[PDB]
Design a protein that fits this description.
- This protein is mostly helical.
- It has one helix and no strands.
- The termini are far apart.
- It is found in: Secreted.
Amino acid sequence: GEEELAENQEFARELAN
């Protein structure tokens, strides 16, 4: 929902995993 819209950028931080 409107959430994935933001996760869109967090992707760059997800790599931190």
